[PDB]
Amino acid sequence: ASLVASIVEARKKRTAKKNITPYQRGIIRSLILTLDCSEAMLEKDLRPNRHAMIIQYAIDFVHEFFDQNPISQMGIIIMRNGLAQLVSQVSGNPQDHIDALKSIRKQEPKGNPSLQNALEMARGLLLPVPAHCTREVLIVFGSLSTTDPGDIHQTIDSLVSEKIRVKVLGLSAQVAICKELCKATNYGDESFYKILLDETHLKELFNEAVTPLPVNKINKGFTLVKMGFPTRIFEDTPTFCSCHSKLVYGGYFCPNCHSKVCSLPTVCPCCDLMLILSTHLARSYHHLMPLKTFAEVPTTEKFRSEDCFSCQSRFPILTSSRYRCEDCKQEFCVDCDVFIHEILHNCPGCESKPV
Amino acid sequence: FIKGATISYGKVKLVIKHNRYFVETTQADILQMLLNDSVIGVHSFEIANESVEVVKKRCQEIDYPVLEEYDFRNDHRNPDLDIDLKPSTQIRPYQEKSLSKMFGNGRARSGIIVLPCGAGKTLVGITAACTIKKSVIVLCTSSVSVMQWRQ
Amino acid sequence: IKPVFERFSSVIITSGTISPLDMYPRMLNFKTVLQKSYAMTLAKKSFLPMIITKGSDQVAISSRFEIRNDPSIVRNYGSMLVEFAKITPDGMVVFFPSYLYMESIVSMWQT
Numbered sequence: 145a146s147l148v149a150s151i152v153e154a155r156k157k158r159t160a161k162k163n164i165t166p167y168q169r170g171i172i173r174s175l176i177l178t179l180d181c182s183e184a185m186l187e188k189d190l191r192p193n194r195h196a197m198i199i200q201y202a203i204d205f206v207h208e209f210f211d212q213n214p215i216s217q218m219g220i221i222i223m224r225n226g227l228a229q230l231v232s233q234v235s236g237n238p239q240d241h242i243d244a245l246k247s248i249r250k251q252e253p254k255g256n257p258s259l260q261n262a263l264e265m266a267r268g269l270l271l272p273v274p275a276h277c278t279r280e281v282l283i284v285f286g287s288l289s290t291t292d293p294g295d296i297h298q299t300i301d302s303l304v305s306e307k308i309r310v311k312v313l314g315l316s317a318q319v320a321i322c323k324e325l326c327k328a329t330n331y332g333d334e335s336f337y338k339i340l341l342d343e344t345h346l347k348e349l350f351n352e353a354v355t356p357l358p359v360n361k362i363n364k365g366f367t368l369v370k371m372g373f374p375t376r377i378f379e380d381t382p383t384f385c386s387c388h389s390k391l392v393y394g395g396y397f398c399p400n401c402h403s404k405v406c407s408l409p410t411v412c413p414c415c416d417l418m419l420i421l422s423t424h425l426a427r428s429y430h431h432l433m434p435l436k437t438f439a440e441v442p443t444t445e446k447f448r449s450e451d452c453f454s455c456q457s458r459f460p461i462l463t464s465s466r467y468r469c470e471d472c473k474q475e476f477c478v479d480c481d482v483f484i485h486e487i488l489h490n491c492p493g494c495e496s497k498p499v
Numbered sequence: 500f501i502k503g504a505t506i507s508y509g510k511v512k513l514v515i516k517h518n519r520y521f522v523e524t525t526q527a528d529i530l531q532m533l534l535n536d537s538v539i540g541v542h543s544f545e546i547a548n549e550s551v552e553v554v555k556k557r558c559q560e561i562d563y564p565v566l567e568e569y570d571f572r573n574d575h576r577n578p579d580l581d582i583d584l585k586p587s588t589q590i591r592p593y594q595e596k597s598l599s600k601m602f603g604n605g606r607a608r609s610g611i612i613v614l615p616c617g618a619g620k621t622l623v624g625i626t627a628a629c630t631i632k633k634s635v636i637v638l639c640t641s642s643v644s645v646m647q648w649r650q
Numbered sequence: 651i652k653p654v655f656e657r658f659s660s661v662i663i664t665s666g667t668i669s670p671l672d673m674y675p676r677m678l679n680f681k682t683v684l685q686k687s688y689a690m691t692l693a694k695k696s697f698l699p700m701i702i703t704k705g706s707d708q709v710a711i712s713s714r715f716e717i718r719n720d721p722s723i724v725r726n727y728g729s730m731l732v733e734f735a736k737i738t739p740d741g742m743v744v745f746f747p748s749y750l751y752m753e754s755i756v757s758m759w760q761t
């Protein structure tokens with residue numbers, strides 16, 4: 145009954161994932177990572193520490209977000225001891241955020257939260273943000289209480305007026321205020337306020353939260369952006385960079401002012417334009433067209449092939465692990481189907497199928 | 500070895516009928532085996548009460564062991580000492596298991612308990628006295644220590 | 651409620667937690683033409699009833715009017731109060747049979 149339980153849990157997951165839709169999602173993103181050094185995250189119920197696995201899983205999320213969404217920029221606000229602090233603003237450089245993260249790892253967490261203070265200066269950080277740059281904040285919380293200098297509801301209505309969507313990730317259980325926050329922040333939706341059960345589910349929440357979020361018709365931002373690629377020149381001399389003024393052997397040229405920069409994807413510092421490559425736009429076409437799930441055929445029918453169409457391995461008999469792409473009508477194994485849906489972004493059976 | 504480790508349990512019983520060791524048996528069936536041994540001197544008889552210590556050894560070699568399992572509640576003759584404890588004391592589960600060792604039947608099984616130092620062995624003995632609830636005395640070859648267990 | 655009975659035929663009686671039913675036609679000299687009870691056909695259980703007869707120290711607990719001022723059982727009761735105060739997300743209510751006893755225990759608790 146182990147395979148039957150695995151099949152019915154995969155059915156429940158498939159019922160959750162039936163809504164495969166090509167929604168327009170948040171691409172030009174601006175992120176704030178609210179963190180807390182409070183005394184609640186000192187508890188050794190988590191091994192070695194709540195704050196420990198916060199530090200390492202935050203480093204992993206920083207890497208995953210800079211990979212999956214390179215063109216976006218993400219900031220870090222730390223809550224500690226009655227007043228929140230800023231250690232990293234929004235940047236295309238992960239290195240500064242990683243260095244701040246390991247500085248927080250070196251230091252001790254202690255304090256008590258002021259979520260209104262964190263939201264207020266997060267509001268000020270997102271104040272000079274363009275309209276196409278979507279404003280999103282991620283929230284972690286290890287407690288059940290927060291004292292705040294003033295009322296939270298004016299802050300709530302003001303941030304709703306600032307057109308923001310926010311996910312909140314609590315430690316213990318659901319809190320009614322954070323549920324209301326995700327409700328009013330996310331147009332009545334309360335799927336944005338989720339609580340973990342263990343570290344495996346916690347990491348799964350991180351891997352979900354790297355992904356972009358679909359955007360509504362009513363908050364329409366249909367416009368154009370003035371984009372331009374830089375040109376890499378493998379130069380023969382140590383040469384000054386525009387930003388840090390240090391002598392670099394090779395690098396890029398600006399498409400307009402011909403200045404060089406250390407890294408991509410970054411704006412120009414001089415003529416002030418976003419300079420990316422085809423990789424960064426190429427990173428999210430599998431968001432732009434998704435990959436619909438593949439028809440796991442039953443063992444009752446006769447099959448076109450009794451071995452895998454892709455990895456070329458023979459199919460088993462009690463259950464039929466022959467998973468058929470509806471866009472290609474070729475059955476694949478469970479291993480190849482899971483790997484293609486998690487990594488690959490084209491069906492080779494659909495490459496075989498002529499159109 | 501386990502099969503040969505089968506004893507005449509419940510078959511020999513000494514009762515102290517007011518400082519008088521009456522060595523009963525549960526049946527007359529025990530008496531015919533017991534009379535084969537002649538070191539001595541339902542059915543009891545005269546034994547030198549100091550010689551009980553040596554004939555306990557002697558019945559260990561002739562493999563009919565006596566048991567000491569006090570029916571204090573059925574011994575109405577000895578005056579009970581009904582003394583309880585406070586609820587603030589907390590019995591640890593190994594002490595609870597130790598209390599279950601001599602109270603598998605409720606009759607006070609006599610024996611040996613050795614525990615590590617500082618394990619509240621005084622408190623375990625106090626609990627054992629508070630559930631035995633009869634006339635009872637405490638012995639130890641010292642003075643400063645004996646008065647501090649009194650305290 | 652007698653002049654209600656002889657004034658109105660269609661006298662219909664209901665409540666939420668009236669259990670059992672039989673002593674109410676005893677305490678009130680009447681009868682019903684029919685009476686039964688209803689329990690919900692809920693999908694999964696979301697109210698969680700349990701009976702706590704002992705603290706985490708395994709000490710029997712009661713609120714009798716004589717042993718109500720027993721400070722050891724009081725300390726147990728506040729160990730329970732501490733452990734639900736640490737974990738309460740939104741709201742939690744405690745009742746007792748008598749308000750003087752509430753004021754007595756909360757007075758010494760604050761003390």
Ligand SMILES: [Zn+2]
Pocket residue numbers: 385386387388389390405406
């Ligand atoms: Zn530079």
Ligand SMILES: [Zn+2]
Pocket residue numbers: 398399400401402403412413414415416417
């Ligand atoms: Zn430029």
Ligand SMILES: [Zn+2]
Pocket residue numbers: 452453454455456457476477478479480481
């Ligand atoms: Zn395969």
Ligand SMILES: [Zn+2]
Pocket residue numbers: 469470471472473474491492493494
């Ligand atoms: Zn296909």
